[PDB]
Short mmCIF file of C-alpha atoms and ligand atoms in Angstrom, two decimals:
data_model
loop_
_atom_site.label_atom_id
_atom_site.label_comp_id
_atom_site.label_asym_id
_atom_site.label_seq_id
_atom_site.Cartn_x
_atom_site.Cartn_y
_atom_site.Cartn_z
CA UNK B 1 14.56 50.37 6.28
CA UNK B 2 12.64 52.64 3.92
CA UNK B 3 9.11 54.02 4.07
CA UNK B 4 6.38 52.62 1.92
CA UNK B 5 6.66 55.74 0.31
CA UNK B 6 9.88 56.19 -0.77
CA UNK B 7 9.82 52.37 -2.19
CA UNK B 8 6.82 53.98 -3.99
CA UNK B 9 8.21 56.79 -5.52
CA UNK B 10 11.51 55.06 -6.04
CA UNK B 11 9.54 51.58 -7.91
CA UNK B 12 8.02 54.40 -10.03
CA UNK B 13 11.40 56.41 -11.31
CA UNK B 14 12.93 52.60 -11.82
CA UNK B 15 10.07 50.46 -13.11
CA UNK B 16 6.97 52.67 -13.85
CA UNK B 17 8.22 55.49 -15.44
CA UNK B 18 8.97 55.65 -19.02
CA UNK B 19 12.51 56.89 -19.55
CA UNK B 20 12.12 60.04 -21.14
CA UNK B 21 14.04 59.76 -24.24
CA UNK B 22 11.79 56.76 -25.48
CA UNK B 23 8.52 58.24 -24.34
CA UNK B 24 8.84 61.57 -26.49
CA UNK B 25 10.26 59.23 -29.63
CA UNK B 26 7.74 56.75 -29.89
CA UNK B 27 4.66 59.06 -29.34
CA UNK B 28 6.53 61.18 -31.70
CA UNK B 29 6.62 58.61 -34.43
CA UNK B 30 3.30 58.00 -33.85
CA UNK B 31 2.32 61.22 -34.37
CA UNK B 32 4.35 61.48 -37.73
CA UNK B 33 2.16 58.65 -39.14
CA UNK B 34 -0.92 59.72 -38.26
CA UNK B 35 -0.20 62.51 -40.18
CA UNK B 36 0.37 60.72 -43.05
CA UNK B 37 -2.43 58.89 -43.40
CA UNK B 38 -4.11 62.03 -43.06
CA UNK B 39 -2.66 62.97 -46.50
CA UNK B 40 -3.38 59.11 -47.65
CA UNK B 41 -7.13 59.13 -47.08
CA UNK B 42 -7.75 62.41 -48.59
CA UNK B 43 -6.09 61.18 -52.05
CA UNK B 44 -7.06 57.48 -52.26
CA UNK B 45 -10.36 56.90 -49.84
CA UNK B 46 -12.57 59.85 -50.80
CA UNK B 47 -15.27 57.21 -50.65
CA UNK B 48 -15.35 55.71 -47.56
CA UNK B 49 -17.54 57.64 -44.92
CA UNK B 50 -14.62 58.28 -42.60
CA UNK B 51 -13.10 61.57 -40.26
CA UNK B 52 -9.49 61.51 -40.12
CA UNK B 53 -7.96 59.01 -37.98
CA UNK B 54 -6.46 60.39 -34.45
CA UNK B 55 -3.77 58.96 -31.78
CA UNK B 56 -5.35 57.78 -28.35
CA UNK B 57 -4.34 55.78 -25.71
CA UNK B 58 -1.79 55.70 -22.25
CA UNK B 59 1.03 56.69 -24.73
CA UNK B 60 -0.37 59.90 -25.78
CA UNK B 61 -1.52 61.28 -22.17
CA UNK B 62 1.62 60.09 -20.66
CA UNK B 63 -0.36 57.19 -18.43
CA UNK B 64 2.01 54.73 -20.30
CA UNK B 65 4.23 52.45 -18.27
CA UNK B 66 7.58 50.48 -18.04
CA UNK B 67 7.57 50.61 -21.86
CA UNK B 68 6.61 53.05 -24.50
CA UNK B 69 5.35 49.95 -27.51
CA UNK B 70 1.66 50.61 -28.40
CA UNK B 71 -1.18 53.44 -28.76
CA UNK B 72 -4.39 53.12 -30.68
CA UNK B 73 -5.64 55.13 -33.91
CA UNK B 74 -9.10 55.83 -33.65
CA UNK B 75 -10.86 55.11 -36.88
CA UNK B 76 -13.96 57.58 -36.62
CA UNK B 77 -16.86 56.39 -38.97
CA UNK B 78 -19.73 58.59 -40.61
CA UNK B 79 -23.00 57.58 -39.74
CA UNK B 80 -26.07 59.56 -40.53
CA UNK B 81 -28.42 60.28 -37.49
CA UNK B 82 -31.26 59.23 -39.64
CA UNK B 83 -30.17 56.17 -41.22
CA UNK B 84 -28.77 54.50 -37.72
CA UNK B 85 -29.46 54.38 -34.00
CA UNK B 86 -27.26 53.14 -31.02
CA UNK B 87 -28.99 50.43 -28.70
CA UNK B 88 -27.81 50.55 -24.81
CA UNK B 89 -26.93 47.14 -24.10
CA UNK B 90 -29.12 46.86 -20.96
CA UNK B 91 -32.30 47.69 -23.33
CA UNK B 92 -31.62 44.51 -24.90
CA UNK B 93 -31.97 40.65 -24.91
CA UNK B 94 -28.08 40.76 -24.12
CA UNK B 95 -28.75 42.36 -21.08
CA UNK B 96 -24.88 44.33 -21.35
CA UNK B 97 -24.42 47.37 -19.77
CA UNK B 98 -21.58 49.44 -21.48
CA UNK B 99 -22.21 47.36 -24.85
CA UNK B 100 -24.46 48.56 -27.83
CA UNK B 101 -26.17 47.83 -30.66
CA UNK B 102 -26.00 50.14 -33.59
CA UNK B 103 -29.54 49.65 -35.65
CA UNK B 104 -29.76 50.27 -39.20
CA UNK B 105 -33.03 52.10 -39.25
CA UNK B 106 -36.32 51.43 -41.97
CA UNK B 107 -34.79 49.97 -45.05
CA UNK B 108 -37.83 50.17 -47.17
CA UNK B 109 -37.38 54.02 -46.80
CA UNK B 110 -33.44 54.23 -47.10
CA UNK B 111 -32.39 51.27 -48.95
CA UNK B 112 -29.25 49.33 -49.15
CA UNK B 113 -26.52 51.40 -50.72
CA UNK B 114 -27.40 54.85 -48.73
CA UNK B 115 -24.67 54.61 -46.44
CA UNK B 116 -21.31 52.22 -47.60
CA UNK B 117 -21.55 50.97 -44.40
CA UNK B 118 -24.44 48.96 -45.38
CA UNK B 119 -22.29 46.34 -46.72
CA UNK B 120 -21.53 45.62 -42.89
CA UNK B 121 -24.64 45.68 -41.76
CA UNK B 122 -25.38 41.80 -40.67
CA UNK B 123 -29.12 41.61 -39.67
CA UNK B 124 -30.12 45.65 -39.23
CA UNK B 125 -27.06 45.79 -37.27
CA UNK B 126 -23.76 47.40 -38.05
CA UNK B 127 -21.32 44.48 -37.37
CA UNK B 128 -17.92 45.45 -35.37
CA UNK B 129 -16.11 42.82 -36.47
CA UNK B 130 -17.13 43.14 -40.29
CA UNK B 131 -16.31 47.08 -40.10
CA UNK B 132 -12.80 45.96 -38.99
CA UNK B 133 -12.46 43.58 -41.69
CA UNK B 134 -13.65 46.02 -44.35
CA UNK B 135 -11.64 48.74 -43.49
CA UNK B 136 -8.28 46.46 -42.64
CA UNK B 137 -8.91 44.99 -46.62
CA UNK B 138 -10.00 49.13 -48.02
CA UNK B 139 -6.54 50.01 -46.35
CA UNK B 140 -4.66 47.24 -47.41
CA UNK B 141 -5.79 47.21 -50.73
CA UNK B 142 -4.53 50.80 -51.52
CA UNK B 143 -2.07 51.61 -48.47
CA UNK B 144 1.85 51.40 -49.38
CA UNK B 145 3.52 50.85 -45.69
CA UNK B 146 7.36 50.34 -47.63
CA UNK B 147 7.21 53.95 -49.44
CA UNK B 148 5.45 55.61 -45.75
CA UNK B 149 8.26 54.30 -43.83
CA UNK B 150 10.86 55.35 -46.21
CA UNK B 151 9.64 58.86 -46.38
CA UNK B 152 9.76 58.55 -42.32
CA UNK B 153 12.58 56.38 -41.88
CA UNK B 154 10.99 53.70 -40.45
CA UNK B 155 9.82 50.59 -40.90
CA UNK B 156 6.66 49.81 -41.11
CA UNK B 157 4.92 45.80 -41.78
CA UNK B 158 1.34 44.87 -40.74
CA UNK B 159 0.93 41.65 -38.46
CA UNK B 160 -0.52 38.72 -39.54
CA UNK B 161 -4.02 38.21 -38.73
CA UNK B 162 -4.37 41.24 -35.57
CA UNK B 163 -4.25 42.47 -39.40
CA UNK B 164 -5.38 45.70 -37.74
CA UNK B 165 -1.87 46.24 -36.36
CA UNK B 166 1.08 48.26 -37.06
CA UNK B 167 4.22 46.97 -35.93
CA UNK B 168 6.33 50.58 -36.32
CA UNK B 169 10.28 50.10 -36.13
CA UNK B 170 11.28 53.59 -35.15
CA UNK B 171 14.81 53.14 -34.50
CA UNK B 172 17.48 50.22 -34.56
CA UNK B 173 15.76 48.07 -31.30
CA UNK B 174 12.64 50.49 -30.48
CA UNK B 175 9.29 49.06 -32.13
CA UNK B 176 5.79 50.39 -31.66
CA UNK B 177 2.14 48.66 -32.26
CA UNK B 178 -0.36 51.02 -33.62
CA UNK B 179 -3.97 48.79 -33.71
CA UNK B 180 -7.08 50.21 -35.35
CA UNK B 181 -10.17 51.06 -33.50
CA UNK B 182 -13.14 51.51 -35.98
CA UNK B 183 -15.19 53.82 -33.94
CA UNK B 184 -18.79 55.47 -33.96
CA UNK B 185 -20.42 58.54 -32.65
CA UNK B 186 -24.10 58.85 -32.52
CA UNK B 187 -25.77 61.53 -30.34
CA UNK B 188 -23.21 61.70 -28.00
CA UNK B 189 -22.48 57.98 -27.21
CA UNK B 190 -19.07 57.23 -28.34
CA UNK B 191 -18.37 53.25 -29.24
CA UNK B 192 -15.85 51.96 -30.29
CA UNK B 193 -15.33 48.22 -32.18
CA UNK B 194 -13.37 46.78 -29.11
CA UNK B 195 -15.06 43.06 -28.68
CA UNK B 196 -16.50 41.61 -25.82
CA UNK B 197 -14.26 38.49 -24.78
CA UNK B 198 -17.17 36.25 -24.64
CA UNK B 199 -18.29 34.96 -28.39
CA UNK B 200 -22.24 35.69 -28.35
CA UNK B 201 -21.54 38.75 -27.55
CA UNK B 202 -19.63 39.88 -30.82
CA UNK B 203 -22.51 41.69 -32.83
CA UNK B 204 -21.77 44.59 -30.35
CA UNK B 205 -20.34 47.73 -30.21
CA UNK B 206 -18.13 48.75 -27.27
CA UNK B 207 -19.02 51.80 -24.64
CA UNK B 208 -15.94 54.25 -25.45
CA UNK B 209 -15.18 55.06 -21.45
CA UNK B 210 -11.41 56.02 -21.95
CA UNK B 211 -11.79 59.75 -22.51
CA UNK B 212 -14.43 60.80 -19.97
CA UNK B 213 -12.23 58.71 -17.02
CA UNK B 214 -8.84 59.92 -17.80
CA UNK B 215 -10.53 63.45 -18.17
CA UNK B 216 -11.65 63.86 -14.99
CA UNK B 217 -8.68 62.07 -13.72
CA UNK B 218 -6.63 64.97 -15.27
CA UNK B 219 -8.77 67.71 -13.76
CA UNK B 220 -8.63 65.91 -10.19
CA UNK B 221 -4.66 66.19 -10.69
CA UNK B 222 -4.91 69.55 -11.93
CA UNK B 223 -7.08 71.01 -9.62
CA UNK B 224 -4.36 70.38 -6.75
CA UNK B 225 -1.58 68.90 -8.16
CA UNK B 226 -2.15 65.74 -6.64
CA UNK B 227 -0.51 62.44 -7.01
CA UNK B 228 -3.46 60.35 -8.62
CA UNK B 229 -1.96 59.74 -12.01
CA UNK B 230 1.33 58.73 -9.82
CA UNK B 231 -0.58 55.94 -7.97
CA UNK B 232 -2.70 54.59 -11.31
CA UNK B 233 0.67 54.46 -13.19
CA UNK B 234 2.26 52.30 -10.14
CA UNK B 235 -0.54 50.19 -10.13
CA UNK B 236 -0.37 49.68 -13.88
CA UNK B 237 2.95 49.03 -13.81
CA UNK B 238 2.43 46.29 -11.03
CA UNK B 239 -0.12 44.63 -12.80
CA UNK B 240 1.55 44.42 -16.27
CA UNK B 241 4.90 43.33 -14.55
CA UNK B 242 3.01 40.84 -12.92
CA UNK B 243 1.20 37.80 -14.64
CA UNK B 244 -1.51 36.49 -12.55
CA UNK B 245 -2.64 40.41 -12.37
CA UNK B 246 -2.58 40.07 -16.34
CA UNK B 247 -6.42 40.47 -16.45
CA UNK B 248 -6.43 43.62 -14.61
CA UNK B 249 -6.69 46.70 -16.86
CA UNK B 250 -6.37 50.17 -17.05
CA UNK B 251 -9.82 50.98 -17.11
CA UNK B 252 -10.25 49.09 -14.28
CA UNK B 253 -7.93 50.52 -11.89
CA UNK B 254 -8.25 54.17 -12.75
CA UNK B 255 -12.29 53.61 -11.68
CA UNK B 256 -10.70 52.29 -8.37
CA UNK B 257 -9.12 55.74 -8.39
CA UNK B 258 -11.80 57.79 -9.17
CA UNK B 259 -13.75 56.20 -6.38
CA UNK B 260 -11.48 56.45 -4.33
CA UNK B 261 -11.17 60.16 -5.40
CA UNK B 262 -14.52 60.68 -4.06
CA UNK B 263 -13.82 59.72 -0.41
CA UNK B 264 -10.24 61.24 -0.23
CA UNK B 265 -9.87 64.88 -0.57
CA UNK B 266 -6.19 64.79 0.00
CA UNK B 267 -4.07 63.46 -2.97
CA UNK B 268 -0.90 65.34 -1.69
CA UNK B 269 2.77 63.96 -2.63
CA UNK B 270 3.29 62.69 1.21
CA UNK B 271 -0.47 60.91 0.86
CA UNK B 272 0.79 58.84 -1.59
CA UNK B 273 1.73 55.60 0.48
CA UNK B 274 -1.81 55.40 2.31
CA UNK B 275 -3.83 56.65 -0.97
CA UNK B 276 -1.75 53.28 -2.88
CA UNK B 277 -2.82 51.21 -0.05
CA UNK B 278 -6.42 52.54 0.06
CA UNK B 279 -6.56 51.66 -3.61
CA UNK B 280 -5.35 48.13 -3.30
CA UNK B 281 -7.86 47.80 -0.60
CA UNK B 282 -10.60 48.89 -2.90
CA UNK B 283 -9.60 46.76 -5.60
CA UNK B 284 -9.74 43.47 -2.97
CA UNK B 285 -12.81 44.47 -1.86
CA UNK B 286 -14.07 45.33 -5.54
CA UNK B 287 -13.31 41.69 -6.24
CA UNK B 288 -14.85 39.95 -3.35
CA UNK B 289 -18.49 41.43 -4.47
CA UNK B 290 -17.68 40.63 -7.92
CA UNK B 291 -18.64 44.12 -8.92
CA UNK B 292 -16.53 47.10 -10.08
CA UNK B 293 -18.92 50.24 -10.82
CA UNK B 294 -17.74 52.84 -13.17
CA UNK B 295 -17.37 56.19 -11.80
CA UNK B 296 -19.10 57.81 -14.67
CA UNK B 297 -21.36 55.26 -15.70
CA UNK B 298 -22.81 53.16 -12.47
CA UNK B 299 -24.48 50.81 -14.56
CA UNK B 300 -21.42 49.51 -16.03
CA UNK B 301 -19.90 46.55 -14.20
CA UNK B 302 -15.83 46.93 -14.85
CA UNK B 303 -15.58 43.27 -14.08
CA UNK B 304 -18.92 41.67 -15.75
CA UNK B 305 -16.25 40.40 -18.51
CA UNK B 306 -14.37 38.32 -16.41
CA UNK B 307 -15.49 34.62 -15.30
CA UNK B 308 -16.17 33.88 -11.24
CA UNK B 309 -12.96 32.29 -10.96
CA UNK B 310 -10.89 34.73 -12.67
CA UNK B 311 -11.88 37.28 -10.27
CA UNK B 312 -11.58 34.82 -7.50
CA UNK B 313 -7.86 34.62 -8.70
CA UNK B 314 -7.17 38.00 -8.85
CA UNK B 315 -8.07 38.59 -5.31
CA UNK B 316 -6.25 35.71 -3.93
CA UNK B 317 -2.86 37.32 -5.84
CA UNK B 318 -3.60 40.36 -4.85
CA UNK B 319 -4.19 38.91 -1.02
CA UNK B 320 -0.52 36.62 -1.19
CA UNK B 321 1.34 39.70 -2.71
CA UNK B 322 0.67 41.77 0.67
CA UNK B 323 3.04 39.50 2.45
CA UNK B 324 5.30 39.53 -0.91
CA UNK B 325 6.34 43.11 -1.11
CA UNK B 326 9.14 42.89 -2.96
CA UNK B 327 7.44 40.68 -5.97
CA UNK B 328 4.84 43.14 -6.37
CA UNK B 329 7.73 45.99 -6.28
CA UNK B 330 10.18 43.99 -8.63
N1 GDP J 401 -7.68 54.33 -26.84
C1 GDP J 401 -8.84 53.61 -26.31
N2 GDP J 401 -8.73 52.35 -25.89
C2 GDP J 401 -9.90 51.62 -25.35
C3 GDP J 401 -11.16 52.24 -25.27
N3 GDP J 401 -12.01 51.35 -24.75
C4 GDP J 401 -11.36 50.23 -24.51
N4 GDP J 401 -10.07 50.35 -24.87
C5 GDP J 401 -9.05 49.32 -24.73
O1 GDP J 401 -8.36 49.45 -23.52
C6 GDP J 401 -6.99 49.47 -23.82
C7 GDP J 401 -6.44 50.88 -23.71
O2 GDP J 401 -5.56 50.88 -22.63
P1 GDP J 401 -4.92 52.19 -22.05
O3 GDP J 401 -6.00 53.10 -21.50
O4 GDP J 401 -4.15 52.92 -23.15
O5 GDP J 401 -3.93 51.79 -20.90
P2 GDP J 401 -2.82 50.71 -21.13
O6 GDP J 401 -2.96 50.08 -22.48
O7 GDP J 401 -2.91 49.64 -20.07
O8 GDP J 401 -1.48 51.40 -21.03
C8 GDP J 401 -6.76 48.87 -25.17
O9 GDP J 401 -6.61 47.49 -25.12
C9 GDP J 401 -8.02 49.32 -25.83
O10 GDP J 401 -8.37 48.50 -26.89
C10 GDP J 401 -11.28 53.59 -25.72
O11 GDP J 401 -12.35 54.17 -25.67
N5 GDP J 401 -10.14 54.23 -26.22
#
């Protein structure tokens, strides 16, 4: 019957892509919002050491899939060079690539109350989890959702606790979830307060990798209008319309791209099929050693979050579905 590429491109246009009255809608009523909270932190948070919040995510650079229902907004924090330093994971007792520790430096000299962040400072360290609470109670404790949503005609309610997400009602039976990522730039590492899944790992800070990968993604695409956007989408859409693949990310399989990237020269339309297969490949053989290396950052195991048997899990799906072509397709 039909090529492996045409039930490619034709899985994508059904299943992958976004259709493209929803996709300009909800990114557009994202976009309203952010604006006003713009306007809403200038009048009632003059206090709090913030930049203005900013859209990020699939959703915004058009890597979204099947459905057009969440983006983040980036929740930049000001920290002074001198008061605070970032920790590379690897440097410490943790022994996490890709995680930090953000120090609150000589207290004697700057003392509690230089920075407002110092209230969620737990042990010399600025706390992820206690910035999120902080700034989820500062919000909610002067932030008027009802009157926003009126003015944009939608409606807008909070979620109950995931109290740092939106749950935006942009028309009749469309919805969107904006969540809140507190995040911190010092030097020129970018974290951002997304937690480790493990517990003991919770007093750090999160290795911001979205922006550098989907940048040179973009300028790989660019370059020579090649297809490797087309394949990551596919693959995202697979793994999100499949559940035992439900512990597969983004991140994840756009590094299996970028790899892949490096070996193949020749991302043309018609390269497609074998460039899809080449990446599930890669992502089997990822598995079996356990070890996914980002592109931009070696160091940084892609899987070192996930347990032995999870990944052992995810290959054996991944192995079954070869012979199940039409699951993995729909
Ligand atoms: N926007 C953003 N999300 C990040 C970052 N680091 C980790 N994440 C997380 O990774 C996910 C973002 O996924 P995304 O790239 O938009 O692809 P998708 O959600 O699968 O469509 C969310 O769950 C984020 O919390 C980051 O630096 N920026």
């Amino acid at each position: 019957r039909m090529s492996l590429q045409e039930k490619l491109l034709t899985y994508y246009r059904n299943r992958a892509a976004i259709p493209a009255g929803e996709q300009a809608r909800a990114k557009q009523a994202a976009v309203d919002i952010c604006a006003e909270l713009r306007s809403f932190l200038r009048a009632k948070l003059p206090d709090m050491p913030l930049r203005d919040m900013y859209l990020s995510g699939s959703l915004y650079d058009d890597l979204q899939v099947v459905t057009a229902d969440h983006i983040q907004l980036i929740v930049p924090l000001v920290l002074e060079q001198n008061l605070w330093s970032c920790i590379p994971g690897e440097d410490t007792i943790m022994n996490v690539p890709g995680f930090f520790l953000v120090r609150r430096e000589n207290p004697e000299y700057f003392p509690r109350g230089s920075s407002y962040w110092d209230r969620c400072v737990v042990g010399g360290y600025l706390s992820p989890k206690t910035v999120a609470d902080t700034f989820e109670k500062v919000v909610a404790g002067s932030i008027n959702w009802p009157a926003i949503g009126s003015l944009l005609d939608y409606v807008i309610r909070p979620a109950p606790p995931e109290a740092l997400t939106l749950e935006v009602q942009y028309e009749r039976d469309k919805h969107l979830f904006i969540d809140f990522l507190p995040s911190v730039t010092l030097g020129d590492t970018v974290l951002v307060a997304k937690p480790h899944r493990l517990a003991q790992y919770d007093n750090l800070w999160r290795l911001s990798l979205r922006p550098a990968e989907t940048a040179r993604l973009r300028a790989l695409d660019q370059a020579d209008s090649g297809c490797r956007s087309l394949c990551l989408k596919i693959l995202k859409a697979i793994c999100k319309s499949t559940p035992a693949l439900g512990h597969l990310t983004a991140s994840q399989l756009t590094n299996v791209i970028l790899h892949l990237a490096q070996e193949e020269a020749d991302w043309s339309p018609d390269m497609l099929a074998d460039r899809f297969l080449q990446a599930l490949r890669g992502l089997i053989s990822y598995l079996e050693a356990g070890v996914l290396p980002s592109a931009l950052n070696p160091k940084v195991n892609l899987f070192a979050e996930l347990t032995p048997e999870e990944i052992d899990e995810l290959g054996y799906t991944l192995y079954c579905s070869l012979s199940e072509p039409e699951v993995l397709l729909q």
